[PDB]
Amino acid sequence: MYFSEQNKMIRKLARDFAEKELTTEILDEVEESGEFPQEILDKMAKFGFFGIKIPKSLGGSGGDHMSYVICMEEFARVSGVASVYLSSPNSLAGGPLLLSGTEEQIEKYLKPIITGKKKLAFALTEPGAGSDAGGMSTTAVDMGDYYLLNGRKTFITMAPLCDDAVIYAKTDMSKGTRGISAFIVDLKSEGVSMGKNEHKMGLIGCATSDIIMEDVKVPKENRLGEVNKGFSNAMKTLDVGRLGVASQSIGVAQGALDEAIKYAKERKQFGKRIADFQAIAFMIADMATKLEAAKLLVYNAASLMDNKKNATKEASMAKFYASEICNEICAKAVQIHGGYGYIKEYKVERMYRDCRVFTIYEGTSQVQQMVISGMLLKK
Amino acid sequence: MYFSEQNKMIRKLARDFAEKELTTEILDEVEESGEFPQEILDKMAKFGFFGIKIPKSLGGSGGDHMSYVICMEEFARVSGVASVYLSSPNSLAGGPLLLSGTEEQIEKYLKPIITGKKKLAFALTEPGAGSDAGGMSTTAVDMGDYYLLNGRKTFITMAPLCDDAVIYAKTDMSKGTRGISAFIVDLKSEGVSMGKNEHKMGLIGCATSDIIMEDVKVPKENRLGEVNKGFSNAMKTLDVGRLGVASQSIGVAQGALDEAIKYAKERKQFGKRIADFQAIAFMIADMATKLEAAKLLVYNAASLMDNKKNATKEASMAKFYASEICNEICAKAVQIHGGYGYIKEYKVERMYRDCRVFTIYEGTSQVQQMVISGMLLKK
Amino acid sequence: MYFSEQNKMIRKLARDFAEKELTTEILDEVEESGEFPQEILDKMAKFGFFGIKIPKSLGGSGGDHMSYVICMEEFARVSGVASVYLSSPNSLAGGPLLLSGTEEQIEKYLKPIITGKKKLAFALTEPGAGSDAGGMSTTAVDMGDYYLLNGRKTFITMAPLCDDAVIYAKTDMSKGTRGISAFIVDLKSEGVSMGKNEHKMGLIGCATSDIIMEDVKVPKENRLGEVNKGFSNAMKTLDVGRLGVASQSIGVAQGALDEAIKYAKERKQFGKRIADFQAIAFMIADMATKLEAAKLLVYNAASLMDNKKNATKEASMAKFYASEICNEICAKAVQIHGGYGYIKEYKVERMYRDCRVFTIYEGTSQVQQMVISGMLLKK
Amino acid sequence: MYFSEQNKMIRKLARDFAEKELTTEILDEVEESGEFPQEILDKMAKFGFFGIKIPKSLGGSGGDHMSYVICMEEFARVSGVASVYLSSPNSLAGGPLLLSGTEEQIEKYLKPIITGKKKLAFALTEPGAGSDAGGMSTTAVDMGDYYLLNGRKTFITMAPLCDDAVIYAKTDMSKGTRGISAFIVDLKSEGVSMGKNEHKMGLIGCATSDIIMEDVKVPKENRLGEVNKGFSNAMKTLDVGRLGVASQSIGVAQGALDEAIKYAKERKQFGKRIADFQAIAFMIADMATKLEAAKLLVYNAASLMDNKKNATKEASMAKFYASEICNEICAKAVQIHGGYGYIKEYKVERMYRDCRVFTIYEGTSQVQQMVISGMLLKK
């Protein structure tokens, strides 16, 4: 779109930073030892990347959505897992706090994660409930002085590293999608237990496991907003989160392309260089135009959010198209690198593996199509 | 992108107009009798659609590029051939006049075509020179009091209806791309003769033939700008023209989609309506998201032109992606209509046929990829 | 696959024939005047092309299914409409006779159409019943000595040229798919009336209209096989018909490819010939490998039919994949021809238009996917 | 095609075998410890899988090419790395021996690898010479009683496990593609040294490194056939090898599809089971029809080889189309599994990673297109 002069500066910051602090030496160590260095996280919160769109009124940074997408893109370009550690407090953890949270809860909960002292997990997915989050099975019972919960959450990002976790349980089992409340649970409490870290294909550096809740008591003073609102809470958080996922799609995309034209300029085979063979140069073109076309897709979505019009469709398109053509791009970049793009030392293979969940998690491409077509066909 | 409040009004105008004046009854008669009604052309120039981006300083309308794209889109949606009769004086005829034309030439030539009295053909393509316009063969010789030309131009839109035609001939046969001048030729003069109207697949209502030049003398006072500049003249006209072609791609696209979701809402087969079958609804989604993604592509290109930064890449992407996904869309719309979308009474078949040149003319998709990749790979 | 030496001979015949009798001069007149020359049909039946798979036991020709596909392919390469006039008596007309017809019915009905004296239309589709042929609305009532019918059929190939027509009507309206009988109706009789010839996009030379039935009485002696088997009758004819449609898919494909590499060898741009630009040569490759891959798909289906195992899935895959990649091929061939491929004199545009229905009629690609997936997931 | 009854039996054997000996427990340990169990290789040679197409005349097994593809497919379905350990002695090692090797050389070299005592690496690729194998830089000098070599080979499968290696060096540096001889070098000799094992994305269990030659002297008695024929030797081995690669393409495809429809039958969302949502069932269909279409592509190529006509194009199409649509399939299968398909315990992710090299090695898809188009346009 068009970038505000402050957002151009932020772009400059996230560039020099993400490029400078995420060295080859480190990122290799993250894949081998699935542990992101706490020192870097602290370093990020110190300059506020953990607080981009939250305003100074609550002790944030006072940026706009476009600044969140800009930082998301420019980070994810260099490393995927970095992006994961970035989106959580900006969007998935700091979302429902920012919407359905009393002033006390925000004082005791949000500012810690913006400054990097506390870590917060957004926990919705169950073994029986994936795309159909409305078909949850975790229960939440009102006992008066506290709430009692009994359930199980799979695929919970960062959870073993998290201190509290926003967990969605079914309060009114009859109302279904109308009867879900949202609670803040201290993961250190009773009954709560974690599953094994899951061995995933990519995005290695951030642990991901199950949250098991066994007769865990949660005080009433730690419930998110109104009772039976939890579902709308999670949707309206999910829109900005999906903007996040499309944002990292576009990041790692632009990156794998940059590595693409670099290798294609440098490698020679028939006396010509690779990039002077028509098949390749056209292929580069094709990738470039999709990437831009759709950069414009997602930029537009975020600008809508910033000007307060509903972005529920526009974001869904952004996540869908961005992640899909990201995968197409990542693959093609392998193919330009040729054989060498299959060895782990060439950065393009880590990308190719990373960019695959992008079409699954945060709502599959199918769920995206369901939202969009369902929005265009109502009569 | 974001639309200026005047451009929203223009959108309203071109909508009510194109919708109101291009009735089924007429458009059917245009396909049967390959003749667009002069009365409608006059009607268009009377409200200035023939003069959108040319400023009031020269007797134009004072709009911006985004207003040219808006009108191009909203017209082309309803009828392709209408768009053709629209882009000519706005972009292809009024371009080189606006750039490399003396004040006298513009007084005697441009204002007529803005008011619809004169018609001007942009003639570059030869039988031997297509994508490679630099390999022209029409010659132009300096005799002192006039220029003498000898050549032949194929595929010249509107030419039998045109009064003068901007014709590019080779002056310095040795310089090639560096030695091409541009001349204004009265088509009524000596030696000049026209070929047969070509029977094309779609875009029926506008005649298209060869311009044959046989020892035709042209006065020196009718040359475009400097000698041997003609080529750069034609390129810099071609950028805004390509914006035009992408503009009509996006128009007829949005239209065939609108007909798409309409038929899919109305038709019933298994008791359900068509649109409630998952394959279709998802298909609608896919088409919609590409179309928007890329609407954002071309809107962005035009905004760049309006703010004076070079749009030579951005436009090329716009023409490429827009026309290609337009064809994909047009086809899919046939497939939703099912059998009925194969009969001429259903508007979708005229679209499907129209939208096919979009990837060929104004520079093929291959030439587009050549420009783009060649721009990204220079080292 | 591997062709039996007699089938190679048949390939030679249909090649030299279709090439020699279907000249450019004729086919243009067929497009302009939507009338195929009766003299050519007679000429075809005289050498037996009207009777390929019907055996000499009934006075047919004694070929195998692979011989029907061979003639279908080699004809369709040269002209689409020829194929339409070819498949009808081989598959669509001679099918239900061959399954559920007594020897008398075959004596009075089939031999005429094998020798080209009579013409038979296969009429199933209604305005309300397309893909869902089971939701028919045409009725058939038992009066003892004859049946009484009241309904309406759209999109009936060749019908205004046909002497009798196999019409599927609902006898037991409650049984639905289980309660449909098939009757032979002489179109010259009472009540029978035709709709307008439909103006279709391509495949021009064969009329196609509605068959309107208003209290038309039909004798019992003209019913297909047992009562209420008709639906399975029509399905099992539809399988070999679908083999037909894939056959012409593969035909027009080979043609448009042959024009593709021919034009690409002959035309030169920028000094090189077209075919020496890497993009084109690769494009040719891509079309070729798909085409072959899937030629092998369809040859195999027909060979299965010849060795008597059920070919109901395999044919469905053949029709689906063959028709879709046929369209992709046809388009790409236009794009190689460049601008010239948009004028009707270049054969590639007639192909491009013909090959479009291929994915709709004889069961859409969607119906194909429904059949195939429904066949693979039953456990 | 149509399988000879002995080849159906062989299909049964390789199925029950690959299924019974390659258990989940083992294959996980192979990924973790990049070492395939020697006990299994011995077990395979004991039943002759190491000698499929080599005939009993030389102490082989007497199968046909179709039997090599059958075992390749049915093995690769279950595990990719198994296939790698399978194709080497059948095609890549036993190829050049079979063409340009004297009976003594075959006595001392081939029978060991058919019985699994010795291992032979096919070493052609250099760091400067990939697709352009003709631009080699390894040298071979004639000293009379032996040859002296100095060069370097990257990406040599199985090399650290191999006892001898067929190495292609340039003898006449001026003749280029016409001046390459092929030699057998015992890897335990002098000068010979190995590079590091390369960390590849998938196909983990088989080591792959550089073969470094530093003034290694090789006796004349170990040269392949006539001098300077070696290149055509290596090409004509590469054709059957490419048939191999397409064979495993088709294998891992069938596997990932089988996991696809299995998971899609068992998993239920929103109340329905996965497979009863139209998008999925159609997706399954699409993968299936392509897979079959092209299974037929490759079966046919191998049958041609068995009946002795040149299969150089047909195999190239088979490798190209087979590997590409294999990747498309593998990915889509991930997407059906949803989130769970991104964790290593679900077999589909190992497939997805394995099937990626398939389009690069044994000649890239680009080299395939170059061969195919170059074969179709020569006139």
Ligand SMILES: Cc1cc2nc3c(=O)[nH]c(=O)nc-3n(C[C@H](O)[C@H](O)[C@H](O)COP(=O)(O)OP(=O)(O)OC[C@H]3O[C@@H](n4cnc5c(N)ncnc54)[C@H](O)[C@@H]3O)c2cc1C
């Ligand atoms: C797991 C594995 C095992 C291997 N085993 C063996 C083995 O046993 N023996 C062996 O000899 N090799 C082996 N190789 C090497 C492999 O076969 C080759 O590397 C392969 O041919 C590609 O080589 P390259 O990457 O150097 O090609 P590069 O030339 O480096 O790649 C160029 C890229 O651009 C494309 N390209 C190349 N030339 C052109 C052109 N003129 N026009 C357009 N596009 C072009 C290609 O498609 C490719 O994508 C193995 C590789 C791997 C990954």
Ligand SMILES: Cc1cc2nc3c(=O)[nH]c(=O)nc-3n(C[C@H](O)[C@H](O)[C@H](O)COP(=O)(O)OP(=O)(O)OC[C@H]3O[C@@H](n4cnc5c(N)ncnc54)[C@H](O)[C@@H]3O)c2cc1C
């Ligand atoms: C040139 C021509 C010749 C013909 N000749 C004959 C002939 O000789 N005999 C004859 O009987 N018919 C004939 N037909 C009719 C043709 O075979 C049928 O119309 C065809 O089956 C499609 O019918 P329809 O358009 O009504 O389908 P519609 O149902 O009107 O179309 C529905 C559309 O949505 C899709 N769709 C349908 N149901 C579903 C679903 N449940 N889920 C998802 N998607 C769905 C379909 O793919 C299709 O694109 C002819 C048609 C043409 C164009």
Ligand SMILES: Cc1cc2nc3c(=O)[nH]c(=O)nc-3n(C[C@H](O)[C@H](O)[C@H](O)COP(=O)(O)OP(=O)(O)OC[C@H]3O[C@@H](n4cnc5c(N)ncnc54)[C@H](O)[C@@H]3O)c2cc1C
């Ligand atoms: C309706 C219509 C209106 C037109 N109006 C005008 C007009 O007003 N003015 C005008 O000047 N022209 C006009 N044209 C012509 C059109 O602009 C030209 O045809 C177009 O620029 C391409 O020329 P060509 O068709 O001759 O392409 P050709 O070059 O003849 O065709 C070459 C083909 O191969 C590809 N190709 C070409 N060069 C290369 C390369 N180097 N590498 C790889 N692939 C390549 C192209 O994609 C194309 O498919 C019109 C055409 C049509 C159909």
Ligand SMILES: Cc1cc2nc3c(=O)[nH]c(=O)nc-3n(C[C@H](O)[C@H](O)[C@H](O)COP(=O)(O)OP(=O)(O)OC[C@H]3O[C@@H](n4cnc5c(N)ncnc54)[C@H](O)[C@@H]3O)c2cc1C
């Ligand atoms: C790295 C990672 C991190 C994650 N982090 C989180 C997290 O922080 N919080 C969280 O809540 N979840 C998280 N998840 C889980 C993820 O959000 C869910 O998996 C996702 O929402 C989809 O759920 P599912 O994978 O179970 O899909 P499933 O529903 O189990 O899979 C169904 C499959 O079929 C398709 N499908 C589903 N429903 C339909 C339908 N109605 N019609 C047609 N097709 C359909 C889908 O595309 C999908 O491919 C994470 C997952 C991963 C891999």
